[PDB]
Amino acid sequence: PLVFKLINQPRPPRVSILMFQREFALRLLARPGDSLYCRLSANVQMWANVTHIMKVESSVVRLEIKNPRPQVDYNEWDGLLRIVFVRKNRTISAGFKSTTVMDILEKNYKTFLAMNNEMVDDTKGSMHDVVKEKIDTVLKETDLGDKRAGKCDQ
Amino acid sequence: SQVFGVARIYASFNDTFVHVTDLSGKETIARVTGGMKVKADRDESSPYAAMLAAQDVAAKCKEVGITAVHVKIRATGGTRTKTPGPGGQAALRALARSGLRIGRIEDVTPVPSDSTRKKGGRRGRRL
Amino acid sequence: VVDPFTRKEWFDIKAPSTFENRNVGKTLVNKSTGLKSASDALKGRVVEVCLADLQGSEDHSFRKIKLRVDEVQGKNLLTNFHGMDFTTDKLRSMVRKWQTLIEANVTVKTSDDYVLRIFAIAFTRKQANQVKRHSYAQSSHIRAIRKVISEILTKEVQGSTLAQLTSKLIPEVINKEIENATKDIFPLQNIHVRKVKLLKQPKFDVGALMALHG
Amino acid sequence: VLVQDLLHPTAASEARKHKLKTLVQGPRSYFLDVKCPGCLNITTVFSHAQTAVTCESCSTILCTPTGGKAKLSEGTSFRRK
Amino acid sequence: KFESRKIMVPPHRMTPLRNSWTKIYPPLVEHLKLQVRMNLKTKSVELRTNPKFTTDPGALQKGADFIKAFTLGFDLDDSIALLRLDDLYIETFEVKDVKTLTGDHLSRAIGRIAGKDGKTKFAIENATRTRIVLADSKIHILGGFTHIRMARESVVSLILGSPPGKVYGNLRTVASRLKER
RNA sequence: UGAAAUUCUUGGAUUUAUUGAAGACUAACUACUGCGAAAGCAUUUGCCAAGGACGUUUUCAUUAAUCAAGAACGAAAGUUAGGGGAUCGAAGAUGAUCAGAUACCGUCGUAGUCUUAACCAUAAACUAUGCCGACUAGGGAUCGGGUGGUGUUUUUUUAAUGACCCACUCGGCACCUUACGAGAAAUCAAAGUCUUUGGGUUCUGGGGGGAGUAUGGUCGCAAGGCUGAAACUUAAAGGAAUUGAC
């Protein structure tokens, strides 16, 4: 929430010059294949141009909010990246199938079908369907699923 | 002779319960706590507060008029310590001191045959 | 607002005929208003009592008899036998550290069609002329003694009825049968019947309770 | 134990040693001529009989195998060798 | 107006019982005015009070505490101080109540609580103004409620693997901050 | 809880009593012990298939010992796919606070902890002590088997069981002395029979770091495992025992 305060900041200011932890600044400007790379770098390079300037350990960074903000829902971006980056050492298919993620994302997906009126079948996922297998299939329907969180870009 | 009751003394590390019941576990007759007696947060389970609560219990039993009690002192049991503390000891000292009839002293502590995992972890729980 | 002891009600329980001192304890039933509900409250009463306090023997003889209360008649409450137990400190005084514990068990039906379960314990003693400071029995002896005790208990409880089981159970009959027939396998001591557990009861009977009262 | 004889051990001490561990090794067992009264007949039985040696005519178990030695039947005459 | 309590005797404690019985019973009979009987067959000490004796119902409880603490392995004079002082109580804990130990871990824990020649334990009893029975897996603490609490802190310090030197440091800290007040 | 604050409680918590469901464990008994190649194994009863020791006036007659190559098993944790999910609980989400009494802690809690089908192959996997074999002091306890006793007791009339006691014998797990001898010492009945140096055989090490690192090969989905350096740097790093001075 350190960087994230001045991302969603309404009436976005001109620049941002601030000094933080050097390890946290490495979390900022990390490239997509690191252990340094996590949710935060994809968030910032989605919504804020970032540059490291004059390392003071500590380090100073300059942030610029993209004033034509890219229309990506940061809430779903938050939840998706949070789930896939909590389990970075775990396979992506097994991580959605925990017990409660199969309940929390189940309720979130049926809330996501409240304005769609899709008939939840009796087949719903323990054998072949929406709780177990369809979430596995949507991963294989996008750039994800067998790729890992530290290999997919934004 | 006297009217026999059932006294039940629970001894948690923070608290002392004294609980007078009729025969067969019928209904609660006299029931106070060291917490509701002494307002000092240090003194929530002192032997002093236990004796005060036990004399309150004795007073309410004499208000009812029931004198004899079959007393069942009880530790935490389960996985914590299975010997009732000095709160229960001073409660017994007070119920003897208050002149109530004591039918039978028994130490009913729930002992597990074979316990599950405690809340101490591998390290040890407290201190 | 109002004290319950204003409306609280006082009753009196009485023990069955198999035992001596039938006048044991009284009851506080907090309402006399709903006497259907009061009768139902009295149907679910269970009193555990001492053997000594019920049979007048002054030695606080370490047992415990559970009595379920069933019927109501003019402040006097008719009871039924429900179980047997020891006290905890007796068993903790019994179990010692250089002798061998032997426990046996049996699932039981009794001639009054009661489903029951019976727990017997027996330790091992050491003889007069010992030099070993311990007396462990081989495990074949333990299987044999469990088998003998199981069969003795099974026949002894399938013969009798429930009150007949109680009447055998008071003067320590069954453990002397175990003492006799089990002596030929390994010499034992402290042979007792630890717990007795009702499991299932027949269709609801009343006249047997009145026979068990008088 | 400095100077003793091992060629000629005392027969009592030599009697207690293990079968394999004597001066010259050799068995501690023997044979028997037994007679059951129901036949008046000599049956030759080894002292450590591993099978139930039944008599010739009658179905009478003259000895049962129990651990080391065979337990003779009740009421049976015997003599060594 | 008699009142009768019975307490069992284990044979582990029965030999000091039958040795020091001649000092045990007369202060209960004379100095505390209680009727004291012994069934050596059932190993049962029977404390009953009569209308002859002084009506002190707390004296029966303190006599039961006397016989119980001697049964728990405590000394004669400490239990006589229990007959004198009221604020002295008994804690009793297990090793496995605090930390699960197995085999020689238990033995080494008991040795670290005791120390060589009891020098770890005895230095506790001087500095906690308590008395401790270290039973097989049981610990028994005898003293004031704050004092048995501090002894509980010390023994829980010892049982979790902490070295005895840190225990001496915390011990002299608690002793200095308690004797000053 | 050193101390305190979040949560729940007037619809009643906590505690008391009567029940019911779920899954996990197998206390005390439990050592002064047993089994298993080790890891490991403590409720009853049954089935199956093994195994040691003992006994043997049974059989074969060198069929053996140690083992690169190769092969099975291998705690805990961890990976994939089902089932389960009560306890506790790496992460996480959280209320914190009060002293420099150290860090705090506390409540919820996903993974996991439990099984099935597979993967992995590591421990202070220690008894820090390869395996086979002989010889060299005692002593008293036990565990399994066996041989004796005009022993003892339970007497069933005598017996026979059993159970103890005594004496002997194997085969164990342990103990306690000594020193003949060993060792630097603690200590060791083997760590002895070693300068008076040889029973057989497998593996390993050559001052300390750099470093179990780099690279290559191989095994694995992954995590990792096995194998495994040099450059460079340095006079100590150590093991055991001993004294008293902040």
From Swiss-Prot, chain B:
One of its GO terms (cellular component) is cytosolic small ribosomal subunit. GO terms for molecular function: mRNA binding; structural constituent of ribosome. Keywords: Acetylation, Cytoplasm, Nucleus, Ribonucleoprotein, Ribosomal protein, Ribosome biogenesis, rRNA processing. It is found in: Cytoplasm; Nucleus, Nucleolus. Component of the small ribosomal subunit (SSU). Mature yeast ribosomes consist of a small (40S) and a large (60S) subunit. The 40S small subunit contains 1 molecule of ribosomal RNA (18S rRNA) and 33 different proteins (encoded by 57 genes). The large 60S subunit contains 3 rRNA molecules (25S, 5.8S and 5S rRNA) and 46 different proteins (encoded by 81 genes). uS11 interacts with eS1 forming part of the mRNA exit tunnel. uS11 interacts with snoRNA U3. uS11 interacts with MPP10. Component of the ribosomal small subunit (SSU) processome composed of at least 40 protein subunits and snoRNA U3. This is Small ribosomal subunit protein uS11A.
From Swiss-Prot, chain C:
Keywords: Acetylation, Cytoplasm, Isopeptide bond, Phosphoprotein, Ribonucleoprotein, Ribosomal protein, Ubl conjugation. N-terminally acetylated by acetyltransferase NatA. GO terms for cellular component: 90S preribosome; cytosol; cytosolic small ribosomal subunit. It comes from the Eukaryota. GO terms for biological process: cytoplasmic translation; maturation of SSU-rRNA from tricistronic rRNA transcript (SSU-rRNA, 5.8S rRNA, LSU-rRNA). GO terms for molecular function: structural constituent of ribosome. It is found in: Cytoplasm. Its main location: cytoplasm. Belongs to the eukaryotic ribosomal protein eS1 family. Component of the ribosome, a large ribonucleoprotein complex responsible for the synthesis of proteins in the cell. The small ribosomal subunit (SSU) binds messenger RNAs (mRNAs) and translates the encoded message by selecting cognate aminoacyl-transfer RNA (tRNA) molecules. The large subunit (LSU) contains the ribosomal catalytic site termed the peptidyl transferase center (PTC), which catalyzes the formation of peptide bonds, thereby polymerizing the amino acids delivered by tRNAs into a polypeptide chain. Present with 92400 molecules/cell in log phase SD medium. There are 2 genes for eS1 in yeast. This is Small ribosomal subunit protein eS1A. It comes from Saccharomyces cerevisiae (strain ATCC 204508 / S288c) (Baker's yeast). The chain holds residues 20 to 233 of 255 of the full protein.
From Swiss-Prot, chain D:
Present with 43300 molecules/cell in log phase SD medium. GO terms for biological process: maturation of SSU-rRNA from tricistronic rRNA transcript (SSU-rRNA, 5.8S rRNA, LSU-rRNA); ribosomal small subunit assembly; translation. Its cofactor is Zn(2+). Pfam families: Ribosomal_S27e. This is Small ribosomal subunit protein eS27A. GO terms for molecular function: RNA binding; structural constituent of ribosome; zinc ion binding. InterPro entries: Ribosomal_eS27, Ribosomal_eS27_Zn-bd_dom_sf, Ribosomal_zn-bd. Binds 1 zinc ion per subunit. It is found in: Cytoplasm. Keywords: Cytoplasm, Metal-binding, Methylation, Ribonucleoprotein, Ribosomal protein, Zinc, Zinc-finger. Component of the small ribosomal subunit (SSU). Mature yeast ribosomes consist of a small (40S) and a large (60S) subunit. The 40S small subunit contains 1 molecule of ribosomal RNA (18S rRNA) and 33 different proteins (encoded by 57 genes). The large 60S subunit contains 3 rRNA molecules (25S, 5.8S and 5S rRNA) and 46 different proteins (encoded by 81 genes). Belongs to the eukaryotic ribosomal protein eS27 family. One of its GO terms (cellular component) is cytosolic small ribosomal subunit. The keyword Metal-binding applies. A zinc finger (C4-type) spans 36-58. The modification S-methylcysteine is found at residue 39. The N-terminus is not modified. HAMAP family: Ribosomal_eS27.
UniProtKB/Swiss-Prot annotation, chain E:
Required for small ribosomal subunit (SSU) synthesis. Has a role in the processing of early nucleolar and late cytoplasmic pre-RNA species. Recruits DIM1 to nucleolar pre-RNAs. Indirectly required for cleavage at the A2 site of the 20S pre-rRNA, forming 18S rRNA, and at A1 and A2 sites of other pre-rRNAs. It is found in: Cytoplasm; Nucleus, Nucleolus. GO terms for molecular function: rRNA primary transcript binding; unfolded protein binding. Residues 103-155 form the KH domain. The chain holds residues 93 to 273 of 274 of the full protein. The keyword Cytoplasm applies. Keywords: Cytoplasm, Nucleus, Phosphoprotein, Ribosome biogenesis, RNA-binding. The keyword Cytoplasm applies. It comes from the Eukaryota. GO terms for cellular component: 90S preribosome; cytoplasm; nucleolus; nucleus. This is Pre-rRNA-processing protein PNO1. Component of the small ribosomal subunit, ribosomal RNA processing complex (SSU RRP complex). Interacts with NOB1. Its main location: cytoplasm. Belongs to the PNO1 family. One of its GO terms (biological process) is proteasome assembly. It comes from Saccharomyces cerevisiae (strain ATCC 204508 / S288c).
